[PDB]
Ligand binder design. Sequence first.
Ligand code: NA
Lengths: 93, 141, 4
Amino acid sequence: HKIPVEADFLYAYSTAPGYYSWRNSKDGSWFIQSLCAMLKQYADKLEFMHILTRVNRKVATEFESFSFDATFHAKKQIPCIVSMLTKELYFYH
Amino acid sequence: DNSYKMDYPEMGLCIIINNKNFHKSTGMTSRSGTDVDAANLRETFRNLKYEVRNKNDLTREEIVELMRDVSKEDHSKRSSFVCVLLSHGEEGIIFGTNGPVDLKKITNFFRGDRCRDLTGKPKLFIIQACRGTELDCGIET
Amino acid sequence: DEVD
Ligand code: NA
């Protein structure tokens, strides 16, 4: 008869707790690039958590920072899916 | 039914907050490339049948006010709610153009007891922002 | 590539 007031939120974070998040001045941020691409490709085939999982893999495998500054060069990023959802979410009617 | 009811008349709002230029006194750099993000999101969620509203360069007060107002709209005919934040950040914090905003303060407007039109409906917050200053060195595979 |  009640649901938690915190239920049915999903927080799709670009990066793990505590970490920088990477943005490319020409292509856009690694995360939003990958998120839009995976939605484009899979919103008609996959549940939302499985789409976000593909975003995780795309960011983690296909992106790596290039910098003249050794401190910031060759770095990696993993996004962070935080789900308080109680059901599966499909975008196709 | 193990899946949210997504056949309301409207999929719902998709609010994109796009903060590119910050007040000089904050010491925060301009976020080059974020307009590519905002445009890509706009088109992506348009194709998903969301009602997109792009907002640019909002102060911390404008962000909070926008979320309060949006949470007070009539969502009864909408299946879900999406909010994308594009800004500087730290852990738990998103930056207005003039200072920080607790993420908790933004999302509390949509709590199941405070936004009744969205009770039982998915509320998605997509956050492109730093969560600290750690760097991931990676490991070779 | 830049940091946010
Ligand atoms: Na990113």
